[PDB]
Amino acid sequence: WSCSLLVASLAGAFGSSFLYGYNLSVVNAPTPYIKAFYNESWERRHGRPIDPDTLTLLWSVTVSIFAIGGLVGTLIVKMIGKVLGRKHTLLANNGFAISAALLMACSLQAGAFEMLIVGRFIMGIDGGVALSVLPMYLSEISPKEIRGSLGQVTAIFICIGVFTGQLLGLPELLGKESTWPYLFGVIVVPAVVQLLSLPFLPDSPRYLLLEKHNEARAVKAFQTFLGKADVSQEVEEVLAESRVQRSIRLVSVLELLRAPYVRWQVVTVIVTMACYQLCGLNAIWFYTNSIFGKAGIPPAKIPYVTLSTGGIETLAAVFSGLVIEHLGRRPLLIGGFGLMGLFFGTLTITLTLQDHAPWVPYLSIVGILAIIASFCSGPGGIPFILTGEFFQQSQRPAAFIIAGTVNWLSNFAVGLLFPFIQKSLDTYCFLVFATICITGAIYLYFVLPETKNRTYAEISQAFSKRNKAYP
Numbered sequence: 098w099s100c101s102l103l104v105a106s107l108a109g110a111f112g113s114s115f116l117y118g119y120n121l122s123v124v125n126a127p128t129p130y131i132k133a134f135y136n137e138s139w140e141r142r143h144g145r146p147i148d149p150d151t152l153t154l155l156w157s158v159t160v161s162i163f164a165i166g167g168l169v170g171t172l173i174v175k176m177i178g179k180v181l182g183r184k185h186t187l188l189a190n191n192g193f194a195i196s197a198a199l200l201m202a203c204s205l206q207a208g209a210f211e212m213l214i215v216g217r218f219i220m221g222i223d224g225g226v227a228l229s230v231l232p233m234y235l236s237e238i239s240p241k242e243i244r245g246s247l248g249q250v251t252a253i254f255i256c257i258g259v260f261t262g263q264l265l266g267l268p269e270l271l272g273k274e275s276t277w278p279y280l281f282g283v284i285v286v287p288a289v290v291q292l293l294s295l296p297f298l299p300d301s302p303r304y305l306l307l308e309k310h311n312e313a314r315a316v317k318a319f320q321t322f323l324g325k326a327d328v329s330q331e332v333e334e335v336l337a338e339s340r341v342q343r344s345i346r347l348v349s350v351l352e353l354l355r356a357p358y359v360r361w362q363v364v365t366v367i368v369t370m371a372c373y374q375l376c377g378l379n380a381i382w383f384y385t386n387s388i389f390g391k392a393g394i395p396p397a398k399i400p401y402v403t404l405s406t407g408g409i410e411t412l413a414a415v416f417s418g419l420v421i422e423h424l425g426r427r428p429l430l431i432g433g434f435g436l437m438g439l440f441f442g443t444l445t446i447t448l449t450l451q452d453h454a455p456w457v458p459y460l461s462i463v464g465i466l467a468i469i470a471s472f473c474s475g476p477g478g479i480p481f482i483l484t485g486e487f488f489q490q491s492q493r494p495a496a497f498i499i500a501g502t503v504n505w506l507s508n509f510a511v512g513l514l515f516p517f518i519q520k521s522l523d524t525y526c527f528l529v530f531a532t533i534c535i536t537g538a539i540y541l542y543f544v545l546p547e548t549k550n551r552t553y554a555e556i557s558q559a560f561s562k563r564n565k566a567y568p
Protein backbone atom coordinates (compact mmCIF):
# COMPACT_ATOMS: atom_id res chain seq x y z
CA TRP A 98 0.00 0.00 0.00
CA SER A 99 1.45 3.30 -1.23
CA CYS A 100 0.28 6.60 0.28
CA SER A 101 -2.15 7.76 -2.44
CA LEU A 102 -3.83 4.32 -2.68
CA LEU A 103 -4.96 4.59 0.98
CA VAL A 104 -6.39 8.12 0.69
CA ALA A 105 -8.13 7.19 -2.63
CA SER A 106 -9.65 4.08 -0.99
CA LEU A 107 -10.67 5.76 2.31
CA ALA A 108 -11.95 9.13 0.97
CA GLY A 109 -13.45 7.33 -2.04
CA ALA A 110 -15.45 4.96 0.20
CA PHE A 111 -16.28 7.39 3.08
CA GLY A 112 -18.08 9.89 0.82
CA SER A 113 -19.77 7.22 -1.35
CA SER A 114 -20.47 3.69 -0.09
CA PHE A 115 -20.56 4.69 3.59
CA LEU A 116 -23.31 7.23 2.73
CA TYR A 117 -25.32 4.51 0.96
CA GLY A 118 -25.05 2.36 4.10
CA TYR A 119 -25.84 5.28 6.45
CA ASN A 120 -28.97 6.12 4.43
CA LEU A 121 -30.39 2.59 4.96
CA SER A 122 -30.37 2.82 8.76
CA VAL A 123 -30.65 6.59 9.49
CA VAL A 124 -34.38 6.41 8.72
CA ASN A 125 -35.14 3.85 11.51
CA ALA A 126 -34.53 5.68 14.84
CA PRO A 127 -36.36 9.04 14.06
CA THR A 128 -39.50 7.18 12.80
CA PRO A 129 -41.87 8.29 15.68
CA TYR A 130 -40.69 11.93 15.43
CA ILE A 131 -41.07 12.07 11.62
CA LYS A 132 -44.58 10.51 11.73
CA ALA A 133 -45.62 13.04 14.41
CA PHE A 134 -44.34 15.78 12.05
CA TYR A 135 -46.32 14.39 9.06
CA ASN A 136 -49.49 14.15 11.19
CA GLU A 137 -49.20 17.70 12.59
CA SER A 138 -48.38 19.03 9.07
CA TRP A 139 -51.36 17.30 7.44
CA GLU A 140 -54.07 18.42 9.89
CA ARG A 141 -52.70 22.01 9.90
CA ARG A 142 -52.82 22.15 6.05
CA HIS A 143 -56.03 20.20 5.24
CA GLY A 144 -58.11 21.01 8.35
CA ARG A 145 -58.98 17.31 8.95
CA PRO A 146 -56.96 14.66 10.92
CA ILE A 147 -54.77 12.13 9.08
CA ASP A 148 -55.97 8.49 9.11
CA PRO A 149 -53.57 5.62 10.08
CA ASP A 150 -53.32 4.10 6.57
CA THR A 151 -52.45 7.44 4.89
CA LEU A 152 -49.73 8.07 7.50
CA THR A 153 -48.39 4.50 7.02
CA LEU A 154 -48.24 5.04 3.24
CA LEU A 155 -46.44 8.44 3.53
CA TRP A 156 -43.83 6.82 5.77
CA SER A 157 -43.48 3.79 3.43
CA VAL A 158 -42.97 6.20 0.48
CA THR A 159 -40.43 8.29 2.46
CA VAL A 160 -38.41 5.14 3.30
CA SER A 161 -38.57 3.45 -0.13
CA ILE A 162 -38.37 6.41 -2.63
CA PHE A 163 -34.58 6.21 -2.05
CA ALA A 164 -34.55 3.00 -4.17
CA ILE A 165 -36.24 4.79 -7.12
CA GLY A 166 -33.51 7.40 -6.66
CA GLY A 167 -30.86 4.67 -6.83
CA LEU A 168 -32.36 3.33 -10.09
CA VAL A 169 -32.18 6.82 -11.67
CA GLY A 170 -28.58 7.14 -10.40
CA THR A 171 -27.69 3.71 -11.92
CA LEU A 172 -28.98 4.92 -15.33
CA ILE A 173 -27.43 8.44 -15.18
CA VAL A 174 -23.92 6.83 -15.10
CA LYS A 175 -24.57 5.44 -18.64
CA MET A 176 -25.38 8.96 -19.95
CA ILE A 177 -22.37 10.57 -18.17
CA GLY A 178 -19.98 7.78 -19.30
CA LYS A 179 -16.91 9.08 -21.22
CA VAL A 180 -17.61 12.80 -20.46
CA LEU A 181 -16.31 13.32 -16.86
CA GLY A 182 -14.11 10.35 -15.93
CA ARG A 183 -14.17 8.37 -12.68
CA LYS A 184 -12.80 10.94 -10.19
CA HIS A 185 -14.85 13.93 -11.42
CA THR A 186 -18.04 11.82 -11.39
CA LEU A 187 -17.39 11.06 -7.67
CA LEU A 188 -16.62 14.76 -6.97
CA ALA A 189 -19.72 16.00 -8.88
CA ASN A 190 -21.87 13.40 -7.06
CA ASN A 191 -21.54 15.46 -3.84
CA GLY A 192 -23.96 17.97 -5.41
CA PHE A 193 -26.68 15.39 -4.63
CA ALA A 194 -25.38 14.50 -1.13
CA ILE A 195 -25.20 18.13 0.05
CA SER A 196 -28.49 19.23 -1.60
CA ALA A 197 -30.38 16.21 -0.21
CA ALA A 198 -28.85 16.67 3.27
CA LEU A 199 -30.05 20.32 3.28
CA LEU A 200 -33.55 19.47 1.93
CA MET A 201 -34.07 16.78 4.58
CA ALA A 202 -32.59 18.76 7.51
CA CYS A 203 -34.54 21.98 6.81
CA SER A 204 -37.84 20.15 6.14
CA LEU A 205 -39.06 20.64 9.73
CA GLN A 206 -38.34 24.41 9.73
CA ALA A 207 -40.04 24.85 6.33
CA GLY A 208 -43.02 22.91 7.74
CA ALA A 209 -43.39 20.82 4.56
CA PHE A 210 -43.17 17.01 4.49
CA GLU A 211 -42.62 16.98 0.70
CA MET A 212 -39.05 18.25 1.24
CA LEU A 213 -38.20 15.07 3.19
CA ILE A 214 -39.64 12.79 0.45
CA VAL A 215 -37.82 14.79 -2.30
CA GLY A 216 -34.62 14.75 -0.19
CA ARG A 217 -34.71 10.94 0.18
CA PHE A 218 -35.08 10.72 -3.62
CA ILE A 219 -32.00 12.87 -4.45
CA MET A 220 -29.95 11.03 -1.79
CA GLY A 221 -31.02 7.88 -3.70
CA ILE A 222 -29.59 9.23 -6.98
CA ASP A 223 -26.32 9.86 -5.09
CA GLY A 224 -26.26 6.27 -3.80
CA GLY A 225 -26.89 4.95 -7.35
CA VAL A 226 -23.98 6.91 -8.88
CA ALA A 227 -21.72 6.16 -5.86
CA LEU A 228 -22.15 2.36 -6.13
CA SER A 229 -21.71 2.29 -9.94
CA VAL A 230 -18.53 4.43 -10.18
CA LEU A 231 -16.63 3.59 -6.95
CA PRO A 232 -15.97 -0.10 -7.96
CA MET A 233 -14.71 1.18 -11.35
CA TYR A 234 -12.37 3.76 -9.73
CA LEU A 235 -10.97 1.38 -7.05
CA SER A 236 -10.34 -1.53 -9.46
CA GLU A 237 -8.70 0.81 -12.04
CA ILE A 238 -6.20 2.56 -9.68
CA SER A 239 -5.10 -0.58 -7.81
CA PRO A 240 -2.18 -3.02 -8.30
CA LYS A 241 -3.05 -6.19 -10.25
CA GLU A 242 -2.53 -8.36 -7.14
CA ILE A 243 -5.21 -6.76 -4.92
CA ARG A 244 -8.15 -6.07 -7.33
CA GLY A 245 -9.78 -9.18 -5.77
CA SER A 246 -9.84 -7.69 -2.23
CA LEU A 247 -11.55 -4.42 -3.14
CA GLY A 248 -14.99 -5.90 -3.86
CA GLN A 249 -14.98 -6.51 -0.09
CA VAL A 250 -13.81 -2.96 0.81
CA THR A 251 -16.95 -1.44 -0.80
CA ALA A 252 -19.00 -4.04 1.17
CA ILE A 253 -17.36 -3.36 4.57
CA PHE A 254 -17.85 0.42 4.28
CA ILE A 255 -21.60 -0.08 3.64
CA CYS A 256 -21.76 -2.04 6.93
CA ILE A 257 -19.77 0.62 8.85
CA GLY A 258 -22.41 2.92 7.30
CA VAL A 259 -25.46 1.01 8.62
CA PHE A 260 -23.76 0.71 12.03
CA THR A 261 -22.99 4.47 12.22
CA GLY A 262 -26.61 5.33 11.31
CA GLN A 263 -27.73 3.09 14.21
CA LEU A 264 -25.09 4.57 16.56
CA LEU A 265 -26.01 8.28 15.97
CA GLY A 266 -29.71 7.32 16.32
CA LEU A 267 -29.19 6.34 20.02
CA PRO A 268 -31.17 8.66 22.38
CA GLU A 269 -27.87 9.74 24.01
CA LEU A 270 -26.59 11.14 20.67
CA LEU A 271 -28.92 12.58 17.96
CA GLY A 272 -32.06 10.36 18.12
CA LYS A 273 -33.98 12.75 20.42
CA GLU A 274 -37.20 14.65 19.62
CA SER A 275 -35.38 18.04 19.56
CA THR A 276 -32.39 16.90 17.42
CA TRP A 277 -33.70 14.42 14.83
CA PRO A 278 -33.09 16.89 11.88
CA TYR A 279 -29.32 16.67 12.48
CA LEU A 280 -29.42 12.91 11.66
CA PHE A 281 -29.93 14.03 8.03
CA GLY A 282 -27.92 17.26 8.36
CA VAL A 283 -24.72 15.35 9.39
CA ILE A 284 -24.58 13.77 5.88
CA VAL A 285 -22.78 17.01 4.85
CA VAL A 286 -19.61 15.82 6.69
CA PRO A 287 -18.81 12.69 4.51
CA ALA A 288 -19.46 14.83 1.42
CA VAL A 289 -17.17 17.70 2.56
CA VAL A 290 -14.37 15.29 3.66
CA GLN A 291 -14.47 13.79 0.14
CA LEU A 292 -14.59 17.18 -1.68
CA LEU A 293 -11.55 18.39 0.32
CA SER A 294 -9.41 15.26 -0.34
CA LEU A 295 -10.19 13.71 -3.77
CA PRO A 296 -9.11 16.80 -5.85
CA PHE A 297 -5.46 16.31 -4.76
CA LEU A 298 -5.28 12.70 -6.06
CA PRO A 299 -4.73 11.57 -9.70
CA ASP A 300 -7.60 10.57 -11.99
CA SER A 301 -7.87 6.88 -12.97
CA PRO A 302 -4.80 5.88 -15.07
CA ARG A 303 -6.95 3.89 -17.54
CA TYR A 304 -9.40 6.74 -18.21
CA LEU A 305 -6.43 9.09 -18.73
CA LEU A 306 -4.91 6.63 -21.23
CA LEU A 307 -7.89 5.17 -23.17
CA GLU A 308 -10.66 7.79 -22.92
CA LYS A 309 -8.66 11.06 -22.46
CA HIS A 310 -5.79 10.02 -24.85
CA ASN A 311 -3.17 11.57 -22.51
CA GLU A 312 -0.37 9.01 -22.07
CA ALA A 313 1.95 11.33 -20.09
CA ARG A 314 -0.69 11.85 -17.35
CA ALA A 315 -1.54 8.11 -17.34
CA VAL A 316 2.15 7.29 -16.71
CA LYS A 317 2.28 9.88 -13.88
CA ALA A 318 -0.89 8.42 -12.30
CA PHE A 319 0.46 4.83 -12.47
CA GLN A 320 3.78 6.08 -10.99
CA THR A 321 1.85 7.79 -8.14
CA PHE A 322 -0.58 4.97 -7.24
CA LEU A 323 1.79 1.97 -7.68
CA GLY A 324 4.77 3.81 -6.12
CA LYS A 325 7.38 2.78 -8.74
CA ALA A 326 9.21 4.37 -11.70
CA ASP A 327 9.10 1.73 -14.49
CA VAL A 328 5.34 1.39 -15.08
CA SER A 329 5.91 0.35 -18.74
CA GLN A 330 4.25 -3.06 -18.29
CA GLU A 331 1.16 -1.45 -16.68
CA VAL A 332 0.51 0.89 -19.63
CA GLU A 333 0.96 -1.85 -22.26
CA GLU A 334 -1.42 -4.23 -20.40
CA VAL A 335 -4.19 -1.57 -20.52
CA LEU A 336 -3.53 -0.73 -24.20
CA ALA A 337 -3.59 -4.48 -25.01
CA GLU A 338 -6.95 -5.04 -23.27
CA SER A 339 -8.37 -2.00 -25.12
CA ARG A 340 -7.07 -3.28 -28.51
CA VAL A 341 -9.03 -6.49 -27.70
CA GLN A 342 -12.22 -4.70 -26.49
CA ARG A 343 -12.31 -2.36 -29.56
CA SER A 344 -12.97 -5.47 -31.72
CA ILE A 345 -16.21 -6.32 -29.83
CA ARG A 346 -19.78 -5.21 -30.64
CA LEU A 347 -21.96 -5.05 -27.50
CA VAL A 348 -25.23 -7.00 -27.15
CA SER A 349 -28.07 -4.56 -26.36
CA VAL A 350 -30.38 -5.06 -23.33
CA LEU A 351 -33.51 -6.00 -25.32
CA GLU A 352 -31.40 -8.30 -27.56
CA LEU A 353 -29.94 -10.08 -24.48
CA LEU A 354 -33.52 -10.63 -23.18
CA ARG A 355 -34.70 -11.98 -26.57
CA ALA A 356 -31.70 -14.28 -27.30
CA PRO A 357 -32.62 -17.96 -26.55
CA TYR A 358 -28.97 -19.10 -26.26
CA VAL A 359 -28.70 -17.19 -22.92
CA ARG A 360 -32.28 -17.65 -21.61
CA TRP A 361 -31.55 -19.52 -18.34
CA GLN A 362 -28.56 -17.24 -17.57
CA VAL A 363 -30.88 -14.21 -17.79
CA VAL A 364 -33.62 -15.95 -15.75
CA THR A 365 -31.05 -17.06 -13.09
CA VAL A 366 -29.82 -13.44 -12.75
CA ILE A 367 -33.37 -12.04 -12.43
CA VAL A 368 -34.40 -14.71 -9.85
CA THR A 369 -31.18 -14.30 -7.80
CA MET A 370 -31.28 -10.46 -7.77
CA ALA A 371 -34.98 -10.58 -6.81
CA CYS A 372 -34.40 -13.02 -3.89
CA TYR A 373 -31.33 -11.03 -2.74
CA GLN A 374 -33.66 -8.07 -2.00
CA LEU A 375 -37.08 -9.74 -1.51
CA CYS A 376 -35.55 -11.92 1.26
CA GLY A 377 -36.38 -8.76 3.28
CA LEU A 378 -32.96 -7.97 4.79
CA ASN A 379 -33.47 -4.27 3.96
CA ALA A 380 -36.76 -4.37 5.92
CA ILE A 381 -34.49 -5.17 8.91
CA TRP A 382 -32.50 -1.91 8.38
CA PHE A 383 -35.45 0.40 7.55
CA TYR A 384 -37.79 -0.95 10.26
CA THR A 385 -35.71 -2.54 13.06
CA ASN A 386 -37.12 -0.69 16.10
CA SER A 387 -40.72 -1.58 15.10
CA ILE A 388 -39.79 -5.27 14.65
CA PHE A 389 -38.15 -5.43 18.11
CA GLY A 390 -41.14 -3.53 19.56
CA LYS A 391 -43.62 -6.15 18.26
CA ALA A 392 -41.22 -8.89 19.46
CA GLY A 393 -41.75 -7.70 23.06
CA ILE A 394 -38.30 -6.24 23.81
CA PRO A 395 -38.81 -3.62 26.64
CA PRO A 396 -39.30 -0.10 25.12
CA ALA A 397 -36.21 1.40 26.86
CA LYS A 398 -33.83 -1.33 25.58
CA ILE A 399 -34.71 -1.26 21.88
CA PRO A 400 -32.24 1.50 20.67
CA TYR A 401 -29.27 -0.39 22.23
CA VAL A 402 -30.50 -3.87 21.15
CA THR A 403 -30.86 -2.64 17.53
CA LEU A 404 -27.19 -1.50 17.58
CA SER A 405 -26.17 -5.19 17.65
CA THR A 406 -27.68 -5.73 14.17
CA GLY A 407 -25.19 -3.38 12.42
CA GLY A 408 -22.45 -4.86 14.64
CA ILE A 409 -22.99 -8.49 13.55
CA GLU A 410 -23.40 -7.36 9.92
CA THR A 411 -19.96 -5.66 10.09
CA LEU A 412 -18.38 -8.75 11.74
CA ALA A 413 -19.89 -11.05 9.10
CA ALA A 414 -18.82 -8.72 6.24
CA VAL A 415 -15.16 -8.72 7.44
CA PHE A 416 -14.95 -12.55 7.45
CA SER A 417 -17.06 -12.83 4.23
CA GLY A 418 -13.87 -13.08 2.14
CA LEU A 419 -12.68 -16.20 4.04
CA VAL A 420 -15.88 -18.15 3.28
CA ILE A 421 -16.32 -17.25 -0.42
CA GLU A 422 -12.80 -18.52 -1.28
CA HIS A 423 -13.40 -21.92 0.39
CA LEU A 424 -16.91 -23.25 -0.33
CA GLY A 425 -17.58 -22.19 -3.93
CA ARG A 426 -20.66 -20.40 -5.24
CA ARG A 427 -23.34 -23.12 -5.39
CA PRO A 428 -23.42 -24.37 -1.70
CA LEU A 429 -22.93 -20.82 -0.32
CA LEU A 430 -25.85 -19.37 -2.30
CA ILE A 431 -28.23 -22.33 -1.76
CA GLY A 432 -27.27 -22.84 1.90
CA GLY A 433 -27.38 -19.05 2.46
CA PHE A 434 -31.02 -18.60 1.36
CA GLY A 435 -31.84 -22.03 2.82
CA LEU A 436 -30.66 -20.96 6.31
CA MET A 437 -32.40 -17.56 6.21
CA GLY A 438 -35.63 -19.41 5.36
CA LEU A 439 -35.10 -21.55 8.50
CA PHE A 440 -34.40 -18.57 10.81
CA PHE A 441 -37.44 -16.60 9.51
CA GLY A 442 -39.27 -19.81 10.54
CA THR A 443 -38.01 -19.83 14.15
CA LEU A 444 -38.35 -16.03 14.37
CA THR A 445 -42.08 -16.50 13.52
CA ILE A 446 -42.39 -19.08 16.35
CA THR A 447 -40.65 -16.89 18.96
CA LEU A 448 -42.72 -13.82 17.97
CA THR A 449 -45.94 -15.90 18.28
CA LEU A 450 -45.16 -17.59 21.62
CA GLN A 451 -43.58 -14.40 23.08
CA ASP A 452 -46.08 -14.40 25.98
CA HIS A 453 -45.28 -17.94 27.24
CA ALA A 454 -42.09 -17.09 29.15
CA PRO A 455 -40.12 -13.83 29.74
CA TRP A 456 -36.92 -15.07 28.04
CA VAL A 457 -38.67 -15.80 24.71
CA PRO A 458 -38.42 -12.23 23.20
CA TYR A 459 -34.61 -12.40 23.53
CA LEU A 460 -34.59 -15.51 21.28
CA SER A 461 -35.97 -13.23 18.53
CA ILE A 462 -32.75 -11.16 18.86
CA VAL A 463 -30.67 -14.34 18.26
CA GLY A 464 -33.10 -15.13 15.40
CA ILE A 465 -32.62 -11.74 13.69
CA LEU A 466 -28.82 -11.89 14.20
CA ALA A 467 -28.63 -15.42 12.68
CA ILE A 468 -30.47 -14.07 9.59
CA ILE A 469 -27.95 -11.19 9.24
CA ALA A 470 -24.96 -13.54 9.74
CA SER A 471 -26.39 -16.09 7.23
CA PHE A 472 -26.80 -13.42 4.52
CA CYS A 473 -23.38 -11.71 4.89
CA SER A 474 -21.39 -14.98 5.10
CA GLY A 475 -22.73 -16.04 1.67
CA PRO A 476 -25.54 -14.41 -0.43
CA GLY A 477 -24.27 -10.89 0.41
CA GLY A 478 -21.52 -11.03 -2.27
CA ILE A 479 -22.13 -13.90 -4.71
CA PRO A 480 -24.97 -12.54 -7.00
CA PHE A 481 -22.66 -9.89 -8.55
CA ILE A 482 -19.88 -12.51 -8.93
CA LEU A 483 -22.26 -14.89 -10.79
CA THR A 484 -23.48 -12.12 -13.15
CA GLY A 485 -19.84 -11.82 -14.31
CA GLU A 486 -19.15 -15.58 -14.57
CA PHE A 487 -22.27 -16.31 -16.71
CA PHE A 488 -21.71 -13.85 -19.60
CA GLN A 489 -19.08 -12.91 -22.24
CA GLN A 490 -17.39 -9.48 -22.31
CA SER A 491 -19.79 -8.43 -25.13
CA GLN A 492 -22.88 -9.38 -23.06
CA ARG A 493 -21.68 -8.30 -19.61
CA PRO A 494 -22.57 -4.54 -19.91
CA ALA A 495 -26.21 -5.39 -20.71
CA ALA A 496 -26.46 -8.16 -18.08
CA PHE A 497 -25.61 -5.68 -15.29
CA ILE A 498 -28.34 -3.25 -16.48
CA ILE A 499 -30.91 -6.08 -16.10
CA ALA A 500 -29.40 -7.20 -12.77
CA GLY A 501 -29.23 -3.60 -11.43
CA THR A 502 -32.78 -2.71 -12.53
CA VAL A 503 -34.23 -5.83 -10.83
CA ASN A 504 -32.17 -5.04 -7.69
CA TRP A 505 -33.49 -1.48 -7.17
CA LEU A 506 -37.12 -2.30 -8.12
CA SER A 507 -37.07 -5.14 -5.55
CA ASN A 508 -35.57 -2.93 -2.82
CA PHE A 509 -38.36 -0.39 -3.49
CA ALA A 510 -41.10 -3.07 -3.12
CA VAL A 511 -39.73 -4.34 0.23
CA GLY A 512 -39.33 -0.79 1.60
CA LEU A 513 -42.86 0.16 0.46
CA LEU A 514 -44.91 -2.95 1.34
CA PHE A 515 -43.36 -4.27 4.61
CA PRO A 516 -45.46 -1.98 6.95
CA PHE A 517 -48.64 -3.30 5.26
CA ILE A 518 -47.53 -6.94 5.57
CA GLN A 519 -46.89 -6.27 9.31
CA LYS A 520 -50.38 -4.74 9.57
CA SER A 521 -52.14 -7.61 7.75
CA LEU A 522 -50.38 -10.81 8.90
CA ASP A 523 -49.40 -9.36 12.31
CA THR A 524 -47.04 -11.92 13.88
CA TYR A 525 -46.73 -14.15 10.76
CA CYS A 526 -45.27 -11.35 8.58
CA PHE A 527 -41.91 -13.15 8.30
CA LEU A 528 -43.46 -16.27 6.68
CA VAL A 529 -43.50 -14.16 3.48
CA PHE A 530 -39.69 -13.85 3.54
CA ALA A 531 -39.33 -17.51 4.60
CA THR A 532 -41.37 -18.49 1.51
CA ILE A 533 -39.25 -16.28 -0.79
CA CYS A 534 -35.92 -17.56 0.64
CA ILE A 535 -36.95 -21.22 0.33
CA THR A 536 -38.46 -20.72 -3.17
CA GLY A 537 -35.23 -19.01 -4.27
CA ALA A 538 -33.06 -21.75 -2.71
CA ILE A 539 -35.05 -24.58 -4.36
CA TYR A 540 -34.77 -22.86 -7.78
CA LEU A 541 -30.96 -22.49 -7.47
CA TYR A 542 -30.57 -26.13 -6.34
CA PHE A 543 -32.12 -27.34 -9.65
CA VAL A 544 -30.83 -24.73 -12.17
CA LEU A 545 -27.51 -23.20 -11.01
CA PRO A 546 -24.32 -24.96 -12.33
CA GLU A 547 -21.11 -24.98 -10.29
CA THR A 548 -18.94 -22.04 -11.43
CA LYS A 549 -15.96 -22.00 -9.01
CA ASN A 550 -12.64 -22.48 -10.91
CA ARG A 551 -14.57 -23.09 -14.18
CA THR A 552 -14.42 -21.49 -17.64
CA TYR A 553 -17.17 -19.81 -19.71
CA ALA A 554 -16.78 -22.71 -22.18
CA GLU A 555 -17.88 -25.19 -19.44
CA ILE A 556 -20.51 -23.04 -17.67
CA SER A 557 -22.31 -22.15 -20.93
CA GLN A 558 -22.25 -25.85 -21.90
CA ALA A 559 -23.83 -26.72 -18.50
CA PHE A 560 -26.72 -24.28 -19.18
CA SER A 561 -27.03 -25.49 -22.82
CA LYS A 562 -28.97 -28.61 -21.70
CA ARG A 563 -32.01 -26.39 -20.91
CA ASN A 564 -31.45 -23.43 -23.30
CA LYS A 565 -31.71 -26.03 -26.14
CA ALA A 566 -29.96 -23.46 -28.39
CA TYR A 567 -26.48 -22.13 -29.32
CA PRO A 568 -25.06 -18.76 -30.57
Ligand SMILES: *[C@@H]1O[C@H](CO)[C@@H](O[C@@H]2O[C@H](CO)[C@@H](O)[C@H](O)[C@H]2NC(C)=O)[C@H](O)[C@H]1NC(C)=O
Pocket residue numbers: 136137147148149150152
Ligand atom coordinates in the same frame (compact mmCIF):
# COMPACT_ATOMS: atom_id res chain seq x y z
C1 LIG B 1 -52.19 12.26 15.00
O1 LIG B 1 -51.88 13.03 16.16
C2 LIG B 1 -52.91 13.05 17.17
C3 LIG B 1 -52.43 14.01 18.25
O2 LIG B 1 -51.25 13.55 18.91
C4 LIG B 1 -53.14 11.63 17.67
O3 LIG B 1 -54.18 11.62 18.67
C5 LIG B 1 -54.00 10.97 19.89
O4 LIG B 1 -54.09 9.56 19.70
C6 LIG B 1 -53.88 8.78 20.90
C7 LIG B 1 -53.91 7.31 20.50
O5 LIG B 1 -55.11 6.95 19.80
C8 LIG B 1 -54.94 9.13 21.95
O6 LIG B 1 -54.67 8.44 23.17
C9 LIG B 1 -54.91 10.63 22.21
O7 LIG B 1 -55.93 10.99 23.15
C10 LIG B 1 -55.05 11.42 20.91
N1 LIG B 1 -55.02 12.85 21.18
C11 LIG B 1 -55.81 13.74 20.57
C12 LIG B 1 -55.57 15.18 20.92
O8 LIG B 1 -56.69 13.41 19.78
C13 LIG B 1 -53.54 10.74 16.50
O9 LIG B 1 -53.72 9.40 16.92
C14 LIG B 1 -52.52 10.82 15.36
N2 LIG B 1 -52.99 10.08 14.20
C15 LIG B 1 -52.40 8.98 13.71
C16 LIG B 1 -53.10 8.32 12.55
O10 LIG B 1 -51.35 8.54 14.17
